[PDB]
Amino acid sequence: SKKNSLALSLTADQMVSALLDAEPPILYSEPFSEASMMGLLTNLADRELVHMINWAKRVPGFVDLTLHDQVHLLECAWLEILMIGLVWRSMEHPGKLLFAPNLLLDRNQGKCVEGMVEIFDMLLATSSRFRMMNLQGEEFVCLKSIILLNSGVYTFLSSTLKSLEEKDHIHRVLDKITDTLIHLMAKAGLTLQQQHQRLAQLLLILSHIRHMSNKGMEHLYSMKCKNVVPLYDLLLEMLDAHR
């Protein structure tokens, strides 16, 4: 067994700074036809995947895992991670989805792609629920890292002692994040009951993001079967991890 990861020593303020500091670079996208729109979003996604691999390496505790478990966690969570950033970015654009600063799509522009509208509407609904709660960026960053550590945590391909060791470590980082969420909230003046309620309110939204990601994977798979999605190797690779 390894000695305890340094990531469990961080205070609440230190976790926050580590997550803010790790944020990936902001990117800009490069009418629309079914193939042209899917081209823009898929090209944005593959470039964002490259920076997500580097953001992951700076999330406290992630580098302590075996490479194989690190690959499992990214494969399981990549689409939820892109989706939660998207909803974040779109909070101040009611009815629209800010895929990038220079690519703000209207809900109706989702109808240009077969099946996309339904996806857009859940993405938009998530986006309004975050506006309703006045979701903070420090809270957002905690949720994005909870996604990266939690989503693949129950499908590790093993039952070895080492896997129990990894899972237990992932749950302790997850517990530090929870503590960090609670501390942002107390520092913000919420009462104790307000703090417990907001924590649940944010974690329940994670079931909705998982759901958006499962339909987006299906949708992305279909698009790949109808020959619309350009051949982006990293994006293609990650897609097959779900099929």
Binding site: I53, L67, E237, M238
Partner: peptide, 9 residues
């Protein structure tokens, strides 16, 4: 495999 490359480098 790409993922694997990027995670080690």
């Amino acid at each position: 495999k790409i993922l694997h490359r990027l995670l080690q480098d």
